[PDB]
């Protein structure tokens, strides 16, 4: 029953996500939203499973959290049904092309929020460089294990990629950084069988 | 580039147009009535821009025992030899 | 790069990063180099099974790949360098062994076979690489106009010079650089044409300070100007000097790129204007004339914030920054008085095809008094001339008719005309194909095509030139049994002036033609047009301060007359292998 | 077997499909009959020299149209961008595997190239990226035994 | 525990030796606790921007100064280079082998790095390399759980 | 030589004499040019032999034969052997 | 040394003391000159002793040996050399 599948990379821009939402789900421009949140302590921006938010936990009220759908993103429309049902994610890297440099360092997790065959410990990875960065100090795609998030439907449940000490009130760390991320991109690996 | 000296060079004239051959190619050995001692091949050219429509002559020996030269027949009359 | 601040200030910022809206999809084995010597950057692929390009566009869109005609297996050989060793203005591909080169020579669609050049006498060439105690690199440090193999270690500076075609002259040494060879690390060698001169100077970086010397005429180096970094900088390797003009000044400012922790900038202006440039005249008779100039590359910047405020996307064709001449100013002494000329340039540009500078498609120069105190109460105000003038490349030659002044009931504007002489007729022709276009095209450089002339006055019809004169211009094909291009020739074959005085209506206008020329340009025959004045519209335009019907009163029969001078010639040519007499007059009528 | 058409399947009718005659490639004819007549494919990878937009990809999929020793997925391959683009994720010729396409004769059968979503009248996201397509590049590695 | 010295060794007096208590980085506080209590040390690797010669190295020694399950030959490092130098000839994370410094909790104790031949007065081999040291870079990697 | 944007290179290596060439180190297939060792990955350590190893330094010869060469016939190789400009073997050897 | 894009190096590099030098580590070839191992490929995980391997950093003497360099008997060496401005060693040491 094994198969090789067919190896996909997507990339993924989350600002045209934001940007590309439906008018009654409050579209908007990331990088803008991102600013007015940082500056105030508080809010949020867009709806449902498509927003920025601070975070509810009682040591993330000052993090920014970005979540996205991954049923909104249509993955599942860019080859077609017949190529086969499955449809999983494999592993994937957070590129903040960002002005952050060579010595300076972004504290981000990316998460799933939802139910998944997830291994434990690969529900959340860490983004510190942002650089097609996977949260492994190396990457191996053949080291015998499973990656973070790897086996997640393509078109199931959310991710959140949450940006701690953002909120500048708190003179937060990442307050000064946030303000001036351009965008957050996600490079989505999945296999089709 | 850096000329080859080998006729394949082009030339540039009085004022830096690229010249262009005009006339075939006749010999000649007498210049204004001076035996030069030698046969020269003698080619016209004109300007690619023509300004003024000067004719210009390349003089080639046939020959090692003398130099090329250039000759310039200006519309008013005026002949200018170069090089020689 | 952006004009920071209003237009006409001389500061540059850069704006937000966005996205190209197009890239490559290869990505791989590719840089960013010209490779044809046309001024536009070429996304150069050369992988695994695959060579082309994607040159990116002066509009901001890329071609599509492009293959390469020809490209050298050694292309990707670990030593291979480019550098132009033709003397072409192109980069070459080459080699260097200690005794001979490996070149191939740049055709700009691909490369020539390579060849290899065997050194003369007992010439030793350094080896690029080969020795991590000195510096070899590729340099004008001679300011011959050539790159040159330049060697640099800690006790001496050793040229050798370019010959072309990949031969080298013996070295030269160029003394007076010296470092203490135990703390001597190419690393932190420099070269850059920092006074705006011909040759290369030479900066050597020290923890604390630069050590700038200057490179006397290739003859060996000045003494050492040191240049203290400011307070909490420091230089290591991690430390980047850059050198760039990046304020358009025509000359390199040092510009040291800090990561630490936080990347910040420095950056050391050694001057605000090029030093070698004709600065002043004073001929000992009262009279001082002060030359100033500007870059071509901030006249773009104005020009590219001007478009911003009325929603336009400008584009520059000149990559090459020039000086230009700017603000003239003479002083007369004795008198008191000074006059002022500004220029104003746009659209200029590069050719990219014979490597050579067009001209701009347009000047514009007011011309200002500032008589003596004392003199008047701010009499004579200032002129302004418009110019447009033909580049020669009809992208911004047809653009510039959108900036003329408009007049609704004007006469038909100008193009140019081509044609072949054709059993010794003007016969008009459209050119064939693209090469022709181009050499059509290029015959018309530094034609004007236009000009306006207004007064900067306070008053209602300031906007109303006084004048007007636009030109037509023709090129002929005279031979074309050569190498592709063609004997041409032109001139002006029509020529219109208006007269209005700065009053929009009414006119006076007329028209010299050219109707026929000679196999040598001469005006067989010529017309010239006295236009009739235009039927009296219902609104003056006129300062109705005049007497009482005073209008009705200026217009006669006489003025409604069209007037055509018409004029035959002929001339006598003497043409010969021995005789060269043109245009002597025979007859006209 | 040499032409372009718009598949026929009930969801690739938006689909721009490309396919090419191995048998017309003459491959077999660079290299002498005397060493070898076994001439298979090893591994094929797709070039694709178009312009993209700022974090746009590429979807094709690249298939072998006839009889042949097609191991369970190695009888399609799919393309994500188009540098020298293999079908995996990482390409190891040492990893105890067969490669897509490995095995089949390279003077035998038809590949074709398909690109989803291409058709414009339909607003197909790969319509834009076609119009920037110069040429369509395999890279064949093949084996002379 | 912030401090430079020389050191007070038999061999050392003319070493200079930087420090630096974990506890004073604040690195715990970048991330939120819910993510885990246990922060470990993976790897440290050195940076030293400064301006060398081409054959001029670097001497230099980094370690723990406290009470850690630090491996036979984890509990110190060698610094030769000073550009992202780690303490291995080679640096691999998957070589079944315990890293320098691994498992020291982020918070306690405290690095010590160590330049011998440091002292100007004693034609020291270093003393001219550290006047022209302009910072320190410690490159942590470590991890949460 | 230069290669046009597809071109390829198409030539053999092979040894003319009697050693112990294993069943295909016989011969090398070259195919871009450029210290091509004609495998698709070179690695020194899988434990096999390699195309020509443990011939004598001093034994035999080496032909290298471009196919489709002779320009009258129209060969594909015909216009890049015309800007090849030399030939060079990179051989690796040890001594013992 | 300038050397040139196709153009080797001759030299033996040797540990003239006694120690306990593996079989093929008592000396080292040099062919390419430019941080220049004394083998193909470099590892420092294949299980094996390295050349010179295990010697005492202060004991014992190295030699260099350039074969052909006598320029009156027109050794190959022999017009290199007289370019050749250094030798580097970059010695990998450790301490235990």
């Not at chain 3, 695959?50 to 293959?67: N, V």
Request: charged fraction near 20%; charge should be negative.
């Amino acid at each position: 029953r094994d198969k090789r599948a067919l190896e996909v990379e997507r990339t993924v821009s989350l600002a045209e996500v934001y940007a590309g939402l439906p008018k009654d789900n409050g579209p908007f421009s990331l990088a803008q939203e991102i600013d007015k949140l940082v500056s105030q302590g508080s809010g949020s921006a867009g709806s449902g499973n498509n927003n920025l938010a601070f975070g509810a936990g009682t040591d993330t009220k000052t993090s920014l959290q970005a979540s996205v759908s991954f049923a909104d993103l249509k993955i599942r429309e860019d080859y077609p049904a017949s190529l086969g049902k499955i449809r999983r994610i494999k592993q994937i890297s957070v590129t903040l092309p960002a002005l952050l440099g060579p010595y300076q360092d972004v504290q981000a997790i990316l998460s799933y929020g939802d139910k998944a065959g997830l291994a434990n410990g690969c529900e959340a990875l860490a983004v510190s460089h942002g650089m097609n960065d996977s949260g492994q100090f190396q990457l191996d795609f053949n080291d015998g294990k499973f990656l973070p998030f790897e086996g997640i439907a393509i078109d199931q449940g959310t991710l959140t990629l949450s940006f701690p000490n953002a909120s500048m009130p708190e003179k937060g760390k990442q307050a000064t950084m946030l303000k001036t991320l351009n965008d957050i991109i996600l490079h989505i690996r999945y296999t089709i069988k | 580039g850096v000329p080859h000296y080998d006729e394949t060079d082009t030339f540039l004239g009085p004022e830096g147009e690229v010249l262009v051959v005009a006339d075939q190619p006749r010999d000649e050995s007498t210049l204004q009535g001076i035996n030069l001692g030698a046969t020269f091949t003698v080619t016209g050219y004109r300007s690619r821009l023509e300004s003024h429509f000067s004719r210009l002559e390349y003089w080639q020996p046939k020959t090692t025992g003398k130099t090329d030269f250039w000759l310039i027949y200006s519309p008013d009359g005026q002949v200018h030899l170069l090089g020689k | 790069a952006q004009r920071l601040g209003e237009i006409g200030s001389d500061a540059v910022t850069w704006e937000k990063m966005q996205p190209l809206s197009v890239i490559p999809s290869l990505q791989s084995n590719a840089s960013l180099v010209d490779i044809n010597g046309d001024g536009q950057l070429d996304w150069v692929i050369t992988g695994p099974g695959l060579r082309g390009y994607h040159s990116q566009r002066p509009d901001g869109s890329w071609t599509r790949f492009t293959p390469l005609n020809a490209l050298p297996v050694e292309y990707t050989h670990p030593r291979a360098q480019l550098a132009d060793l033709m003397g072409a203005g192109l980069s070459d591909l080459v080699l260097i062994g200690p005794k001979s080169v490996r070149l191939y020579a740049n055709t700009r669609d691909g490369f020539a076979k390579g060849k290899d050049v065997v050194q003369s006498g007992e010439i030793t060439l350094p080896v690029p690489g080969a020795d991590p105690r000195k510096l070899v690199a590729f340099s004008d440090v001679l300011g011959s106009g050539q790159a040159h193999l330049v060697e640099v270690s800690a006790t001496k500076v050793t040229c050798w010079p370019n010959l072309g075609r990949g031969r080298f002259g013996q070295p030269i040494t160029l003394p007076g650089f010296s470092q203490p060879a135990t703390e001597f690390n190419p690393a932190q060698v420099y070269l850059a044409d920092l006074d705006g001169s011909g040759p290369t100077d030479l900066i050597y970086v020290h923890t604390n300070r630069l050590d700038i010397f200057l490179n006397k005429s290739g003859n060996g180096f000045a003494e050492p100007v040191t240049l203290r970094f400011p307070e909490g900088l420091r230089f290591d390797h991690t430390c980047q000097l850059q050198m760039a003009d990046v304020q358009g000044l025509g000359v390199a400012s040092l510009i040291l790129s800090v990561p630490h922790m936080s990347p910040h900038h420095w950056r050391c202006d050694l001057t605000n204007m090029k030093p070698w440039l004709l600065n002043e005249m004073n001929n000992n008779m009262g009279v001082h004339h002060t030359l100033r100039y500007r870059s071509s590359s901030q006249f773009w910047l104005d020009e590219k914030a001007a478009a911003l405020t009325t929603g336009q996307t400008p584009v520059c064709y000149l990559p090459f920054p020039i000086h230009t001449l700017w603000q003239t100013e003479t002083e007369d002494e004795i008198s008191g008085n000074k006059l002022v000329t500004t220029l104003r340039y746009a659209r200029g540009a590069w050719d990219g095809r014979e490597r050579e500078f067009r001209g701009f498609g347009y000047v514009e120069q007011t011309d200002s008094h500032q008589l003596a105190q004392g003199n008047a109460p701010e009499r004579t105000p200032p002129a302004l001339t418009k110019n447009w003038y033909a580049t020669g490349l009809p992208v911004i030659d047809n653009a510039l008719s959108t900036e003329y002044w408009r007049d609704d009931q004007a006469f038909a504007g100008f193009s140019p005309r081509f044609t072949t002489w054709q059993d010794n007729k003007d016969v008009p022709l459209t050119p064939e194909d693209d090469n022709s276009r181009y050499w059509f095209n290029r015959a018309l450089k530094g034609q004007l095509l236009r000009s306006e002339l207004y007064g900067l006055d306070d008053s209602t019809n300031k906007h109303v030139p006084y004048t007007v004169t636009e030109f037509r211009s023709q090129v002929r094909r005279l031979q074309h049994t050569d190498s592709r291009y063609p004997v041409l020739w032109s001139s002006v074959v029509e020529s219109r002036n208006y007269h209005y005085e700065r009053i929009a209506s009414d006119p006076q206008c007329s028209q010299n033609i050219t109707l026929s020329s000679d196999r040598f340009g001469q005006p067989l025959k010529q017309l010239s047009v006295q236009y009739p004045r235009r039927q009296q519209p219902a609104i003056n335009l006129y300062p109705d301060t005049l007497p009482d019907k005073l209008l009705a009163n200026s217009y006669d029969d006489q003025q409604r007359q069209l007037r055509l001078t018409y004029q035959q010639s002929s001339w006598h040519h003497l043409t010969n292998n021995t005789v060269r007499v043109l245009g002597l007059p025979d007859s006209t009528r």
